[PDB]
Amino acid sequence: EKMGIGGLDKEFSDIFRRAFASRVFPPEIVEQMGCKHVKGILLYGPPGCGKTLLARQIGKMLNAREPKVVNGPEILNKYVGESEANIRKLFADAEEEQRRLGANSGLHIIIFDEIDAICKQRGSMAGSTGVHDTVVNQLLSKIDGVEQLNNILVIGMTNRPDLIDEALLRPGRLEVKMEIGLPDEKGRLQILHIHTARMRGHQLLSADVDIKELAVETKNFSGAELEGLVRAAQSTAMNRHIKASTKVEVDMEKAESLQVTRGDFLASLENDIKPAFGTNQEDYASYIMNGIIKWGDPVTRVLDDGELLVQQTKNSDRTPLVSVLLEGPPHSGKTALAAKIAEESNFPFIKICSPDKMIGFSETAKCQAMKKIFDDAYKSQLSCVVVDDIERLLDYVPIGPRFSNLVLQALLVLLKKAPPQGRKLLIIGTTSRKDVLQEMEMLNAFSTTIHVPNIATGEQLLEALELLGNFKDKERTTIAQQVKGKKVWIGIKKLLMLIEMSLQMDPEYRVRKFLALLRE
Amino acid sequence: EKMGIGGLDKEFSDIFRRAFASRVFPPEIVEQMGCKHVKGILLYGPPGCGKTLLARQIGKMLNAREPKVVNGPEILNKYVGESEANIRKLFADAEEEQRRLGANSGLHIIIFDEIDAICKQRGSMAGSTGVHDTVVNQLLSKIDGVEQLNNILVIGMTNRPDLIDEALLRPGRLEVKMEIGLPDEKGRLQILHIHTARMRGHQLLSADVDIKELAVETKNFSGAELEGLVRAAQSTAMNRHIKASTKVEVDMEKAESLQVTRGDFLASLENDIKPAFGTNQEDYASYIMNGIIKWGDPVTRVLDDGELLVQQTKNSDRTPLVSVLLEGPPHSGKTALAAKIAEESNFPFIKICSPDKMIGFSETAKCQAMKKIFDDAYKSQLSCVVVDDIERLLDYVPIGPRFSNLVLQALLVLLKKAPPQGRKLLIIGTTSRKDVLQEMEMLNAFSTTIHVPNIATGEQLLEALELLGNFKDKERTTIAQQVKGKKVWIGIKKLLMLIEMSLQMDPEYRVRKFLALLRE
Ligand SMILES: Nc1ncnc2c1ncn2[C@@H]1O[C@H](COP(=O)(O)OP(=O)(O)OP(=O)(O)O)[C@@H](O)[C@H]1O
Ligand SMILES: Nc1ncnc2c1ncn2[C@@H]1O[C@H](COP(=O)(O)OP(=O)(O)OP(=O)(O)O)[C@@H](O)[C@H]1O
Ligand SMILES: Nc1ncnc2c1ncn2[C@@H]1O[C@H](COP(=O)(O)OP(=O)(O)OP(=O)(O)O)[C@@H](O)[C@H]1O
Ligand SMILES: Nc1ncnc2c1ncn2[C@@H]1O[C@H](COP(=O)(O)OP(=O)(O)OP(=O)(O)O)[C@@H](O)[C@H]1O
């Protein structure tokens, strides 16, 4: 078969049909009317998807018996002038079979590793001291002219793909460059089944651990991200019910091999493996501080228009990109309702583009950071992006109005830039100044808006205060004798200010302290 | 059972579960219930908390006997190109257990003493001739395929966490990114108990020396900030015993003994003024130069509404970020009331963000120095940052009113940026221009404001003049006749200008000058 590779069947059976496909079955047919074989394979990917696991395995499944593994910068560090000589001493042991042939999956491989250390010169003369180019075109020309080997396979990999030389990406040199992305929901029940297979115990981990329960809520992070989930829990199982009393002067195995329980894994994804991507815990709980109380009908009227528009994103093909805009008065709770819509949306990739992780950045350094978030939402099938607090990305201020034009015209594009075809993106935006964006025609950019009001009547003010539950029934009555019939207009976040400044007074005085602060 | 590390019972037992739960305990169930061992630990921190203590101690409680201790920029040494000769001879002796001794000991450690000067990988390779892009992935690919079980355990530590390359912190290479901060109240009677253990007259120093009483008032500053307390207290007790002007060594101990008193510790609390985290009157008395006299209820209404709002920060968990804005006319003693609210609050961390230390800074350097102050607040349990004199940080001037947009957008974010979970902050703002900060939408951002007024009546002027104690009782009688009838309006700082400008006249003309300058 192969050693365990999870969720890469549309790639490993795709470098079947470019490299593996020849060289075993058609040497009686290519000898009739064939052509040259493949030359080399490139491997895209964010770190953690399983690039290197292929070259450990395709260096062994090929039965080649000479895996000439090189590191990336392993060549460069010789004396100045003689740097380029190592790679031509690397092909030369293969190059003696210029005169021969063979059978059973042809047997010379060269494996680079993060190849964009050597293979720089994307077209911008990247580097100096005259070596950053000469080790490129030494390597450009050992696999084209003159012809050789017809039996090597330069399996390269990298993390930064589009910086390799474009003359080294043509099919004469590296035939197949291939996107190895993170596995989907179907791919993560493949890979959990692999790293919990040599585990036997009672039965293959335990009796209680459902890997399908660990498939769906471990919902986006990649391969070695997921290997660390198993490896941490069985390490917590090395401190649980057999070794929970190690007490650094250790015991031996006295309590005899506790199975890795279900409480191990959901403590390990609780603490401390962040998915580093970051999905299903980006700490959106910093934005939803005091929960989501349904203080009125205009809360339910907002978040149902979440799912009546989230399901527009999940089940369409006419509109691959839906961009909504939450608006309303300040302190009204828009960032929470942008997160609570996005968290209850159950998309894989939920990234809150909040400007607090961008403080002090210039007009360029925000656009280079917003580019990184929207490219991380282009690498997913289903993704949501909260572009939070529009008037702080645009560094806006109403004195003679100044703002960033450079961020604006790199945000008016990204509300109308389609993803790769077949991929869905939900953009949620929060703003407190609607009629500023009415000038800049960003209301024209969003698909539709959702007005988030303040608390409207005195019934909602009590209903916001019943659910928080801070005041006594007699103490609620005095406020009920004031605002019932009056006209209050104040946000929910500002209501959390006025409740909490009120409690720090005397216990008989916590009522009209709130009623003094409510007047403004 | 273990050599001294103070107050890191959680963090040191959390690398028990990572690089200490496997690899030693069962030690044959690991190969039965298959599992790779972890490849290293990452140590965050503010400077001086026991990051390098957790290399030297962890290199001696492993019984590993060969810590390959490298330094931070140690590797980079040779000519350009030649740098990676060190970071592949670094793993080379541990590579040589890829032998017939494949498993089974196992000689591990490599200590990156300051990793952030090696690993950046900024993704756009903005660096000439290969500075920080080929020492990174030579390192990224000598700890991956092809690999053994394997031998190594790479411990890297840094003052600056996030500037490390995000490709390297995957669960393959460096699993745990462990937070080593400043210790709490109970962690410090661990570390005072460690360094004063060998300190002895018999086993301890004296009787009046109690570390548990010095645990609670040396409250904020970290471990290396606290060993300097112990070392400079016995240093004070040297010169208490010996005499030192010349090379004189003459004792041959004069009391025939030596012990360190409690008065020798708190002599070195006038030095070591809780550096970089905390104050014990740490020379912010240059903002209160002439005291805070209470000339009426409009001072007591100011410094109690501060200390009520301090109770909101300390007790509450609904609103973990509380902000205030002391406002009023110029020369009204606003800065001095802000430091007095902070000094009467007994917070650990009281840093004053002030424009007087920022003279001549450009618009970028005002944001990053303001960002450095709040990031020190975010590394404490409690904190209170006095953002003083808003319209000088914003470098405001109202002729076609020009200001720094970038400072205002690095200030409207930080007044709402929440500290991490369980930590508090109290931002106190002073400004002279209520209306201009309304025009910038900043009075929106603060929770509440306190109008600090001028003295408005003749009675408050006479009461302010008694408490200073400048004039004479018959001379104040001349003042008491004149300042009544008409109502005056002047600040408290401007009042201190006029009194000193009036004392320097002739003594027969001090009073008839002070009543002349006060006409405007
Ligand atoms: N699809 C997969 N199936 C099984 N295991 C996987 C898969 N993807 C990743 N892994 C795990 O990831 C670990 C190493 O992956 P790899 O080194 O390829 O990450 P990478 O970032 O792609 O490589 P590099 O770090 O060299 O760039 C292996 O231990 C392997 O168990
Ligand atoms: N139904 C609700 N909708 C929104 N927020 C709520 C609700 N119920 C309670 N809250 C609390 O109110 C707070 C709202 O804070 P939030 O920053 O979202 O207000 P905001 O209007 O976005 O302020 P700003 O616009 O200045 O960022 C959250 O901490 C949340 O816990
Ligand atoms: N928890 C602790 N217990 C005992 N001593 C400590 C503790 N924390 C710090 N120290 C003291 O701090 C000193 C070194 O501190 P630390 O290891 O934090 O330096 P560092 O910040 O790691 O320096 P660098 O990062 O440059 O290596 C030692 O003298 C050690 O005794
Ligand atoms: N009751 C009081 N309140 C405030 N300040 C007082 C009081 N009594 C005396 N002072 C003195 O008044 C001085 C005012 O200092 P401060 O810098 O606060 O003035 P200010 O109003 O902030 O000036 P500016 O508005 O120009 O910054 C302080 O040195 C303080 O010692």
Coordinates of all heavy atoms in Angstrom, one line a residue, chain B residues 18-25 37-41 55 58-70 89-97 102-112 142-143 148-155:
Chain B
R18 N 4.9 17.5 28.3 CA 5.3 17.6 26.9 C 6.7 16.9 26.6 O 6.7 15.9 25.8 CB 5.4 19.0 26.5 CG 4.1 19.7 26.6 CD 3.2 19.3 25.5 NE 2.0 20.0 25.5 CZ 1.1 20.0 24.5 NH1 1.4 19.2 23.4 NH2 0.0 20.7 24.5
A19 N 7.8 17.3 27.2 CA 9.1 16.7 26.9 C 9.6 15.9 28.1 O 10.8 15.7 28.3 CB 10.1 17.8 26.6
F20 N 8.7 15.5 29.0 CA 9.0 14.7 30.2 C 8.0 13.6 30.4 O 8.4 12.7 31.2 CB 9.1 15.7 31.4 CG 9.6 15.1 32.6 CD1 11.0 14.9 32.8 CD2 8.8 14.7 33.6 CE1 11.5 14.3 34.0 CE2 9.2 14.2 34.8 CZ 10.6 14.0 35.0
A21 N 6.8 13.6 29.9 CA 5.9 12.5 30.1 C 6.3 11.3 29.3 O 6.3 10.2 29.8 CB 4.5 13.0 29.8
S22 N 6.6 11.5 28.0 CA 7.2 10.5 27.2 C 8.6 10.4 27.5 O 9.2 11.0 28.4 CB 6.9 10.7 25.7 OG 5.5 10.7 25.4
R23 N 9.3 9.5 26.8 CA 10.8 9.4 26.6 C 11.5 8.9 27.9 O 12.6 8.4 27.8 CB 11.3 10.8 26.2 CG 12.8 10.9 25.9 CD 13.1 12.3 25.5 NE 12.7 12.6 24.1 CZ 12.8 13.8 23.6 NH1 13.2 14.8 24.3 NH2 12.4 14.0 22.3
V24 N 10.8 8.9 29.0 CA 11.4 8.3 30.3 C 10.4 7.3 30.9 O 10.9 6.3 31.4 CB 11.8 9.5 31.2 CG1 10.8 10.5 31.3 CG2 12.3 9.0 32.5
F25 N 9.1 7.6 31.0 CA 8.3 7.0 32.0 C 8.1 5.5 31.9 O 8.4 4.8 32.8 CB 6.9 7.8 32.2 CG 7.0 9.1 32.9 CD1 5.9 9.9 33.0 CD2 8.2 9.5 33.5 CE1 6.0 11.1 33.7 CE2 8.3 10.7 34.2 CZ 7.1 11.5 34.3
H37 N 8.2 11.4 19.9 CA 8.5 12.3 21.0 C 8.6 13.7 20.5 O 8.8 14.0 19.3 CB 9.9 12.0 21.7 CG 9.9 10.6 22.2 ND1 9.2 10.1 23.3 CD2 10.6 9.5 21.7 CE1 9.5 8.8 23.5 NE2 10.3 8.4 22.5
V38 N 8.3 14.7 21.4 CA 8.2 16.1 21.0 C 9.6 16.6 20.7 O 10.6 16.1 21.1 CB 7.5 16.9 22.2 CG1 8.4 17.1 23.3 CG2 6.9 18.1 21.6
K39 N 9.6 17.6 19.8 CA 10.9 18.2 19.3 C 11.2 19.5 19.9 O 12.2 20.1 19.4 CB 10.8 18.3 17.8 CG 10.5 17.2 16.9 CD 11.6 16.1 16.8 CE 11.2 15.2 15.6 NZ 10.0 14.5 15.9
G40 N 10.6 20.0 21.0 CA 11.1 21.1 21.7 C 10.1 22.0 22.3 O 8.9 21.8 22.2
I41 N 10.6 23.0 23.0 CA 9.8 23.9 23.9 C 10.2 25.3 23.4 O 11.3 25.6 23.1 CB 10.1 23.7 25.4 CG1 10.0 22.3 25.8 CG2 9.1 24.4 26.2 CD1 10.5 22.0 27.2
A55 N 16.7 26.8 31.1 CA 17.6 26.1 30.3 C 18.7 25.4 31.1 O 18.9 24.2 30.8 CB 18.2 27.0 29.2
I58 N 16.9 22.9 33.3 CA 16.3 21.8 32.5 C 17.4 21.0 31.8 O 17.2 19.9 31.4 CB 15.3 22.3 31.5 CG1 14.3 21.2 31.2 CG2 15.9 22.7 30.2 CD1 13.4 20.8 32.3
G59 N 18.6 21.6 31.7 CA 19.8 20.8 31.2 C 20.5 20.1 32.3 O 21.5 19.5 32.0
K60 N 20.0 20.1 33.5 CA 20.6 19.4 34.6 C 19.6 18.5 35.3 O 20.0 17.5 36.0 CB 21.2 20.3 35.6 CG 22.4 21.1 35.1 CD 22.9 22.1 36.0 CE 23.6 21.4 37.2 NZ 24.9 20.8 36.7
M61 N 18.3 18.7 35.2 CA 17.3 17.7 35.6 C 16.8 16.8 34.6 O 15.9 16.0 34.8 CB 16.0 18.5 36.2 CG 16.2 19.0 37.6 SD 16.4 17.6 38.8 CE 14.7 16.9 38.8
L62 N 17.5 16.7 33.4 CA 17.3 15.7 32.5 C 18.3 14.5 32.5 O 18.0 13.4 32.0 CB 17.2 16.2 31.1 CG 16.6 15.4 29.9 CD1 15.1 15.1 30.3 CD2 16.7 16.0 28.6
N63 N 19.4 14.8 33.2 CA 20.6 13.9 33.3 C 21.1 13.6 31.8 O 21.5 12.4 31.5 CB 20.3 12.6 34.0 CG 20.1 12.8 35.5 OD1 20.9 13.6 36.1 ND2 19.2 12.2 36.1
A64 N 21.0 14.6 31.0 CA 21.3 14.4 29.6 C 22.8 14.7 29.2 O 23.2 14.3 28.2 CB 20.4 15.4 28.7
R65 N 23.5 15.5 30.1 CA 24.9 15.5 30.2 C 25.6 16.3 29.1 O 26.8 16.6 29.2 CB 25.5 14.1 30.4 CG 26.9 14.0 30.9 CD 27.3 12.5 31.1 NE 26.5 11.9 32.1 CZ 26.8 11.9 33.4 NH1 27.9 12.5 33.8 NH2 26.0 11.4 34.3
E66 N 24.9 16.6 28.0 CA 25.5 17.4 26.9 C 24.5 18.4 26.4 O 23.9 18.2 25.3 CB 26.0 16.5 25.7 CG 27.3 15.7 26.0 CD 27.0 14.3 26.7 OE1 25.8 14.0 26.9 OE2 28.0 13.6 26.9
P67 N 24.4 19.6 27.0 CA 23.6 20.6 26.4 C 24.4 21.4 25.3 O 25.4 22.1 25.7 CB 23.2 21.5 27.6 CG 24.2 21.3 28.6 CD 24.7 19.9 28.4
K68 N 24.0 21.3 24.1 CA 24.7 22.0 23.0 C 24.3 23.5 23.0 O 23.6 23.9 22.2 CB 24.3 21.4 21.6 CG 24.9 20.0 21.4 CD 26.3 20.1 21.0 CE 26.6 20.7 19.7 NZ 28.0 20.7 19.3
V69 N 24.8 24.2 24.0 CA 24.3 25.6 24.2 C 24.9 26.5 23.2 O 26.1 26.7 23.1 CB 24.7 26.1 25.6 CG1 24.3 27.5 25.8 CG2 24.1 25.2 26.7
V70 N 24.0 27.0 22.3 CA 24.4 27.9 21.3 C 23.9 29.3 21.8 O 23.1 29.4 22.7 CB 23.9 27.6 19.9 CG1 22.5 28.1 19.8 CG2 24.8 28.2 18.8
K89 N 26.4 21.3 11.8 CA 27.2 20.6 12.8 C 26.6 20.7 14.2 O 27.1 20.0 15.1 CB 28.6 21.2 12.9 CG 29.4 21.0 11.6 CD 29.8 19.6 11.3 CE 30.8 19.1 12.3 NZ 31.3 17.7 11.9
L90 N 25.5 21.4 14.4 CA 24.9 21.5 15.7 C 24.1 20.3 16.0 O 24.2 19.8 17.1 CB 24.0 22.8 15.7 CG 23.5 23.3 17.0 CD1 24.7 23.8 17.8 CD2 22.5 24.4 16.8
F91 N 23.4 19.7 15.1 CA 22.7 18.5 15.2 C 23.5 17.3 14.9 O 23.0 16.1 15.0 CB 21.4 18.5 14.4 CG 20.4 19.5 14.7 CD1 20.3 20.6 13.9 CD2 19.7 19.4 15.9 CE1 19.4 21.6 14.2 CE2 18.8 20.4 16.2 CZ 18.6 21.5 15.4
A92 N 24.8 17.5 14.5 CA 25.6 16.4 13.9 C 25.9 15.3 14.9 O 25.8 14.1 14.5 CB 26.8 16.9 13.3
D93 N 26.3 15.6 16.1 CA 26.6 14.6 17.1 C 25.4 13.9 17.6 O 25.4 12.7 17.9 CB 27.4 15.2 18.3 CG 27.8 14.2 19.3 OD1 28.9 13.5 19.0 OD2 27.2 14.0 20.3
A94 N 24.2 14.6 17.5 CA 23.0 13.9 17.8 C 22.4 13.2 16.6 O 21.6 12.3 16.8 CB 21.9 14.9 18.3
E95 N 22.9 13.5 15.4 CA 22.5 12.7 14.2 C 23.2 11.4 14.2 O 22.7 10.4 13.7 CB 22.9 13.5 13.0 CG 22.4 12.9 11.6 CD 23.3 11.9 11.0 OE1 24.5 12.0 11.3 OE2 22.8 11.0 10.3
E96 N 24.4 11.3 14.9 CA 25.2 10.1 14.9 C 24.6 9.0 15.8 O 25.2 7.9 15.9 CB 26.6 10.4 15.3 CG 27.4 11.2 14.3 CD 28.8 11.5 14.7 OE1 29.2 11.1 15.9 OE2 29.6 12.1 14.0
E97 N 23.5 9.2 16.5 CA 22.7 8.1 17.0 C 21.7 7.6 16.1 O 20.8 6.9 16.5 CB 22.1 8.5 18.4 CG 23.2 8.8 19.4 CD 22.6 9.0 20.8 OE1 21.3 9.1 20.9 OE2 23.3 9.2 21.8
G102 N 19.7 3.2 17.6 CA 18.6 4.0 17.0 C 17.7 4.7 18.0 O 17.7 5.9 18.0
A103 N 17.0 3.9 18.7 CA 16.3 4.3 19.9 C 17.3 4.3 21.1 O 18.5 4.2 20.8 CB 15.1 3.5 20.2
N104 N 16.8 4.3 22.3 CA 17.6 4.0 23.5 C 18.8 4.9 23.8 O 19.9 4.5 23.4 CB 18.1 2.5 23.5 CG 17.0 1.5 23.5 OD1 16.0 1.7 24.3 ND2 17.0 0.5 22.7
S105 N 18.5 6.1 24.3 CA 19.6 7.1 24.7 C 20.5 7.6 23.6 O 21.6 7.0 23.4 CB 20.4 6.5 25.9 OG 19.6 6.2 27.0
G106 N 20.0 8.5 22.8 CA 19.1 9.5 23.4 C 19.8 10.6 24.2 O 19.6 10.7 25.4
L107 N 20.6 11.4 23.5 CA 21.3 12.5 24.1 C 20.9 13.8 23.4 O 21.4 14.1 22.3 CB 22.9 12.3 24.0 CG 23.6 11.5 25.1 CD1 23.2 10.0 25.0 CD2 25.1 11.6 24.8
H108 N 20.2 14.7 24.1 CA 19.2 15.5 23.5 C 19.6 16.9 23.1 O 19.8 17.3 21.9 CB 18.0 15.6 24.4 CG 17.5 14.3 24.9 ND1 18.0 13.7 26.0 CD2 16.5 13.5 24.5 CE1 17.4 12.6 26.3 NE2 16.5 12.4 25.4
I109 N 19.9 17.7 24.1 CA 19.4 19.1 24.2 C 20.2 20.0 23.3 O 21.4 19.9 23.1 CB 19.5 19.6 25.6 CG1 18.8 18.6 26.5 CG2 18.7 20.9 25.8 CD1 19.1 18.8 28.0
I110 N 19.5 21.0 22.7 CA 20.1 22.2 22.0 C 19.3 23.4 22.5 O 18.1 23.5 22.4 CB 20.0 22.1 20.5 CG1 20.8 20.9 19.9 CG2 20.5 23.4 19.9 CD1 20.0 19.7 19.6
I111 N 20.0 24.4 23.0 CA 19.4 25.5 23.7 C 19.7 26.7 22.8 O 20.8 27.2 22.7 CB 20.0 25.8 25.1 CG1 19.6 24.6 26.0 CG2 19.3 27.0 25.7 CD1 20.3 24.6 27.3
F112 N 18.6 27.2 22.1 CA 18.7 28.5 21.4 C 18.4 29.6 22.4 O 17.3 29.8 22.8 CB 17.6 28.6 20.3 CG 17.9 27.7 19.1 CD1 17.0 27.3 18.2 CD2 19.2 27.2 18.9 CE1 17.2 26.6 17.2 CE2 19.5 26.4 17.8 CZ 18.5 26.1 17.0
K142 N 16.7 20.6 9.1 CA 17.5 19.6 9.8 C 16.7 18.9 10.9 O 17.3 18.0 11.6 CB 18.8 20.1 10.3 CG 19.8 20.3 9.2 CD 20.2 18.9 8.8 CE 20.9 18.1 9.9 NZ 21.4 16.7 9.4
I143 N 15.5 19.3 11.2 CA 14.7 18.7 12.2 C 13.4 18.0 11.6 O 12.4 17.9 12.3 CB 14.4 19.7 13.3 CG1 13.6 20.9 12.8 CG2 15.6 20.2 13.9 CD1 13.2 21.8 14.0
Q148 N 15.0 10.5 12.5 CA 15.0 9.4 13.3 C 13.8 9.5 14.3 O 12.8 10.1 13.9 CB 16.4 9.3 14.0 CG 16.8 8.0 14.8 CD 18.1 8.2 15.5 OE1 18.7 9.3 15.5 NE2 18.5 7.2 16.3
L149 N 13.8 8.7 15.4 CA 12.7 8.8 16.4 C 12.3 10.3 16.8 O 11.1 10.6 16.8 CB 13.1 8.0 17.6 CG 12.1 8.0 18.8 CD1 10.8 7.5 18.5 CD2 12.8 7.2 20.0
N150 N 13.2 11.1 17.3 CA 14.7 11.1 17.4 C 15.3 11.7 18.6 O 14.6 11.8 19.7 CB 15.3 11.9 16.2 CG 14.7 13.2 16.0 OD1 13.8 13.6 16.7 ND2 15.1 13.9 14.9
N151 N 16.6 12.0 18.5 CA 17.4 12.3 19.6 C 17.0 13.6 20.3 O 16.8 13.7 21.5 CB 18.9 12.3 19.2 CG 19.8 12.1 20.3 OD1 19.4 12.1 21.5 ND2 21.1 12.1 20.0
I152 N 17.0 14.7 19.5 CA 17.1 16.1 19.9 C 15.9 16.6 20.7 O 14.9 16.0 20.8 CB 17.4 17.0 18.7 CG1 16.2 16.9 17.8 CG2 18.6 16.6 18.0 CD1 16.3 17.8 16.6
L153 N 16.1 17.8 21.3 CA 15.1 18.5 22.0 C 15.5 20.0 22.0 O 16.4 20.4 22.8 CB 14.9 18.0 23.4 CG 13.9 18.7 24.2 CD1 12.5 18.4 23.7 CD2 14.0 18.3 25.7
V154 N 14.9 20.8 21.1 CA 15.4 22.2 20.9 C 14.6 23.1 21.7 O 13.4 23.4 21.5 CB 15.3 22.5 19.4 CG1 15.7 23.9 19.2 CG2 16.2 21.6 18.6
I155 N 15.3 23.8 22.7 CA 14.6 24.7 23.5 C 15.1 26.1 23.1 O 16.3 26.5 23.2 CB 15.0 24.5 25.0 CG1 14.3 23.2 25.4 CG2 14.4 25.6 25.9 CD1 14.8 22.7 26.7

